[PDB]
Amino acid sequence: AKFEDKVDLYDDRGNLVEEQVPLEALSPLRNPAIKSIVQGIKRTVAVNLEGIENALKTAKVGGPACKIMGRELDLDIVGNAESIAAAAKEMIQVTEDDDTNVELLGGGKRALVQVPSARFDVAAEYSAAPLVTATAFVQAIINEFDVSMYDANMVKAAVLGRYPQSVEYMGANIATMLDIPQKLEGPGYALRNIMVNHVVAATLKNTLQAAALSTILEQTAMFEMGDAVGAFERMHLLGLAYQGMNADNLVFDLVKANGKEGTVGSVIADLVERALEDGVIKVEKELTDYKVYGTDDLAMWNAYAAAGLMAATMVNQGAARAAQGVSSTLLYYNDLIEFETGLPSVDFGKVEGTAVGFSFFSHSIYGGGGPGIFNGNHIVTRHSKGFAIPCVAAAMALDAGTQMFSPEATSGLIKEVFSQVDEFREPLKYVVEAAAEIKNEI
């Protein structure tokens, strides 16, 4: 009842799920499924019990190629995973019936851990997840084998690495999708510092789910950063709806029309026609054999363009099954649409700008890497405010094996653990259902 807009919500097979949904029912501030995904990501940890055990047996603790000769400890951690994990859960939980979750995976080699929400309710940020999990497992391992006072510090090193000497948990055998609060490029950035590969890992390379998870996290961060407050709020919500949630089936329909033979440029033409057909843009002036389009609703044009941008990525990188050109698509989709129309590109040039630097820093000596190592906190790709990185996730979902630094390489532990969580793996479903559910409360 702040915004009049309504959107139709679809599933990832293009089937109408709920018509006429108030825009703000998709807001991170209102939607309970977005709230649950975010609180989930804050509290979930993967534990690599095999890695802990192997680091202890070899005394290889504290980072790359590090070893302490004579410190080796040979402990049957994976063989006693059930007792160790139960002992850890007792420490992690606040009470017996809370939302603490500890699940063994891989026959005890791994554990999914979700620290209780009650710990986050009286915490400033999210680091209680790794730190509570890490100490619970360290103490559970020591108690399991009655590790001496003299040797127990090796268990600590195997679990959490070189920390507190390093700022990071360097060489740690636990992982989160989030990174430490010190690494934020700016305050309010923590939900942006989730590697694209981790998103693609957790959604198991399902393109639309990867786009959804990335957009939810990106646009939720825009609220935490203050970017979606006041004048800009509707633009950010429309961006989440049309670019990340396939609102009105616009993304899906553009891909369908252009998947067989289509290119970035063909997607553009369909998007402009569709915006014209829908009344989003109209011809404002004729030059010589050239129509200058305008709009009474910049945020809606932006949203339509952002939908086409995602579809263009899926067409272009989908046709190569190779993610690298997403930097190119992010640039020329936007460059081309501006000269096609006379209207500003997605995020008023900021996606194009991000794409320039991202192209450079994925095809040059200076830094960056493949598409999968970027994220909204990366200095190269933080500039667009939610409209760029979800395309990078869709592109890496569609990659069939062209990347050296693939989600398999960087994110294997995240894949095994975080994909187990249904709301992380299939977020579009949950968010749509929740918006449907709260539809009449807006």
């Binding site: 990832d12 198991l204 390379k205 399902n206 393109t207 639309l208 004048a231 509707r234 899906f252 891909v255 998947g259 067989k260 033979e261 289509g262 290119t263 970035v264 440029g265 063909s266 553009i268 033409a269 030059l287 010589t288 054999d289 050239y290 200058v292 910049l298 899926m314 067409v315 990188q317 989908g318 046709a319 190569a320 099954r321 190779a322 690298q324 050109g325 930097s327 190119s328 640039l331 020329y332 989709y333 460059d335 081309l336 501006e338 000269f339 096609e340 006379g342 209207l343 500003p344 008023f348 040039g349 900021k350 192209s359 095809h363 869709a394 979902a397 569609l398 069939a400 094996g401 062209t402």
Partner: protein, 247 residues
């Protein structure tokens, strides 16, 4: 689609290069083998190296996007991603760096195009790169004097021409022959010698370069005198400026 505003020949040319329904003029005939030699990724008749197994041999995730998006053939085969890169003289080469990337993502599927001042590049699956590259070399994308096929040492876009009207090339990959008035490619795009040079035909004459060029220049058609094109550029500036402040 309208592609680009402007009432100059330059602007029309920019539109034509983007328009996949405009038939690019073919200016020279190049053999399949010679395209492969020029690229320098594999030797003629060498099997295409693979970076992953054929898509048919892999279990893709169930994914409507994958269902709806037909893979190019080299993606189906698992080919490497390889490149071809061109430098265009600012002395009236027909194609120019942004014009190429814009046109490539209008004409070509599955393309990673990069635009730089002295080099413009396209990366895609190798067997598909080979087909695109025939078009890039045979048509008015390319002039053998004002354009050069270069995977490194790209210098020369902004350099003066030599006495033959050829663009500078630190590695002299393209040699004008005064006896035929034709250019031969004597090295591949990375600079290694070809056994047998490739004929690239005659440089375009001055009048034809003017007709076909997509750069604006005071001694050609100046960008400032394309007042409608200067438009849309100033328009975009203003609307972007206003947009980032409020809506």
């Amino acid at each position: 689609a309208q592609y680009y505003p402007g009432t100059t020949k330059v602007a029309q040319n920019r539109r034509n290069f983007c328009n996949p329904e405009y038939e690019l003029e073919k200016l020279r005939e190049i053999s399949d083998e010679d395209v492969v030699k020029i690229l320098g990724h594999r030797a003629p008749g060498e099997e295409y190296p693979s970076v992953h197994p054929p898509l048919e041999e892999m279990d893709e995730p169930e994914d409507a996007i994958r269902e709806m998006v037909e893979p190019i053939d080299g993606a189906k085969a698992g080919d490497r991603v390889r490149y071809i890169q061109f430098t265009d003289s600012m002395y009236f080469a027909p194609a120019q760096p942004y014009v190429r990337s814009r046109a490539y993502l209008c004409r070509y599927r599955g393309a990673d195009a990069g635009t730089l001042s002295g080099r413009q590049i396209i990366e895609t699956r190798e067997r598909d790169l080979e087909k695109i590259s025939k078009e890039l070399l045979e048509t008015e994308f390319f002039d053998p004097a004002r354009s050069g096929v270069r995977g490194k040492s790209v210098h020369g876009h902004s350099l003066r021409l030599d006495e033959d009207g050829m663009m500078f090339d630190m590695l002299r990959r393209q040699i004008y022959n005064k006896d035929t008035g034709r250019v031969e490619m004597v090295k591949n795009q990375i600079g290694d010698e070809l056994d047998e040079p490739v004929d690239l035909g005659e440089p375009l004459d001055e009048e034809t370069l003017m007709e076909k060029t997509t750069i604006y220049r005071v001694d050609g058609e100046a960008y400032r005198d394309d007042v409608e094109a200067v438009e849309i550029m100033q328009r975009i500036h203003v609307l972007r400026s206003q947009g980032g402040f409020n809506l």
